[PDB]
């Protein structure tokens, strides 16, 4: 008889008190608005759209959720802007200017020393 963990998805109280629930590999007919069936389980409380945005709250298998404008949505993470390179057999592209960029990288080096 079906079973599967239950997790609660929240855009964090500090922004809204709504929530959606995913029942892992549970069919939406055997759980007991917005009901969407995905190969990862039954998603309740978010509407599934065909657009794509950046991953917000990973749901699994390509889907995400998040707030929009007043609600929670579940889309499919897109992979990025598409772009064709203007290749030819006798063409080249050379920069005529430049910028200097600065970026951060953070690394941990130690923990607290404990004794029992």
């Amino acid at each position: 008889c079906s079973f599967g963990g239950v997790s609660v998805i929240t855009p964090g109280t500090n922004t809204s008190n709504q929530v959606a629930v995913l029942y892992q590999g549970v069919n939406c007919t055997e759980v007991p608005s917005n009901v969407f069936q995905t190969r990862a389980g039954c998603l309740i409380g978010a509407e599934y759209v065909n657009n794509s945005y950046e991953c917000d709250i990973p749901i699994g298998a390509g889907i995400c959720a998040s707030y929009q404008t007043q609600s929670i949505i579940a889309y499919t993470m897109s992979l990025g802007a598409e772009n064709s390179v203007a290749y030819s057999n006798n063409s080249i592209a050379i920069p005529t200017n430049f910028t200097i960029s600065v970026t951060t990288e953070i690394l941990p080096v130690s923990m607290t020393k404990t004794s029992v």
């Binding site: 005529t96 200097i100 960029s101 600065v102 970026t103 951060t104 953070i106 690394l107 941990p108 080096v109």
Partner: protein, 211 residues
Amino acid sequence: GKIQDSLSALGKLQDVVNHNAQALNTLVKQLSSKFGAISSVLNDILSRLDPPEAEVQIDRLITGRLQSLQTYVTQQLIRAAEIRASANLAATKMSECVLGQSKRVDFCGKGYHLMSFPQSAPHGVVFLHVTYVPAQEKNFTTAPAICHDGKAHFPREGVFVSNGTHWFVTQRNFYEPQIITTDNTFVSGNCDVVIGIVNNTVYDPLQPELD
């Protein structure tokens, strides 16, 4: 200057603090468990039973809490190996990004590495990576070599470009054209083996000096 705006991120440093705080909060809470015994205060179980009857109940609690310590220490060893691997990466970057210039791709930031500056963080290190990023490209027509006097000329460094009517030599990382001369190029082979070779003039400085 924009770096401060992005700060005023460090979740990797807070996670280290959280993981140890959670193991210490759990280790203490595991003392309020009976493990199937009579009570959990080594005193109750004592001032309430005989030397030969309070021995079984206390032995159960001892086994349970001794298992708690084994769980705690095993996880600290596994987690200390992970922070050690991170400290090894940070020490390696300190040598190769700060004390020198690296050619390793993406090891010292995004772009072409120029320099890096360290900053101290609590239980960690922050690297300020300075990189070179090209911008504003234009397209040109190119050719691998140029024919002059029936001989093939190849660039010493750079690429041949055409602006539409004339051909120049440029360096590969910044557009800066110069005239193609015999001091800019070298000769190798004939114009019968290079695919895509084009006709142009390569100027010799000697003859116009000799009028």
